[PDB]
């Protein structure tokens, strides 16, 4: 769909007005590109919270996985968008979603050094013993990338 492609672009670009017009005009809130990204992936990734909220309110799949198994929550954790993480979790995002690489949102936040996101994930029930493809936990990953503060927080658990 052309409207689907336009919505994906509007969500990525942070064009709030255009997002709402497209949706009203017929765009599927769960439009997919060839890599499996939805408008919600792109808005979470590019840190457009108002778009995230509009999409979720009108039925976007909070747990949609792209071609490699990544959810909007993985992406928000990756770029360090704390409010978006919080909003996704409230909308029912799987806190322990796993991609093809065996990576969970807690792995991501831990590697990319996002302490507040780590805290919110843990409170939401993130699994500290989750192992990736290579047998590593978020604490292992935090410690190996030199995020000692996060690694201490996780090692207590």
């Amino acid at each position: 769909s052309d409207l689907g492609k336009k919505l994906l672009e509007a969500a990525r670009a942070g064009q709030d007005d255009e997002v709402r017009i497209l949706m009203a005009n017929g765009a599927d809130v769960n439009a997919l590109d060839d890599s499996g990204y939805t408008p919600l992936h792109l808005a979470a990734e590019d840190g457009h919270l108002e778009i995230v909220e509009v999409l979720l309110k009108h039925g976007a799949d909070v747990n949609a996985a792209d071609r490699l198994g990544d959810t909007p929550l993985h992406l928000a954790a990756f770029v360090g968008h704390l409010e978006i993480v919080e909003v996704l979790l409230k909308a029912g995002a799987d806190v322990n979603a796993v991609d093809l690489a065996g990576v969970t949102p807690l792995h991501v936040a831990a590697f990319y050094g996002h302490l507040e996101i780590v805290e919110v994930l843990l409170k939401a029930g993130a699994d500290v013993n989750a192992q990736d493809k290579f047998g590593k936990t978020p604490a292992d990953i935090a410690a190996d990338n030199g995020h000692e503060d996060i690694a201490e927080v996780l090692q207590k658990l």
């Binding site: 060839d34 890599s35 990734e45 590019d46 071609r67 490699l68 990544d70 993985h74 992406l75 990756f78 770029v79 991609d99 093809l100 690489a101 065996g102 990576v103 792995h107 991501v108 590697f111 990736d132 493809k133 290579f134 590593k136 990953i141 190996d144 990338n145 030199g146």
Partner: protein
Amino acid sequence: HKCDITLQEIIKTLNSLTEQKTLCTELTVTDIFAASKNTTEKETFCRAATVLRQFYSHHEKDTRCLFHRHKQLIRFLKRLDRNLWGLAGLNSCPVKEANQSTLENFLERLKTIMREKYSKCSS
């Protein structure tokens, strides 16, 4: 032999990266491939992701680089990083290597490795 979805997406991202001749794709990064003699595939990819991560971190907030073609570059560099989680792991692998390559040529070298790797599913 089924074709690896991960490799497929990595290649898509690399093709997008190397078709756009942006201003800052001429900036140089450490040529980690020069230091990969008797090195595992996993380590080679970890060394490459580490360099790529450093680049998009340092040049995302770069006034000289800035204004929409640079946005796509950084976007796709972050994508590449995520695409490599399954091959490289969530790890940092620094190298002593002094040799430098343009980001363009570095990404071309990585594309070659990946596309050769992908062609194995044709066996």
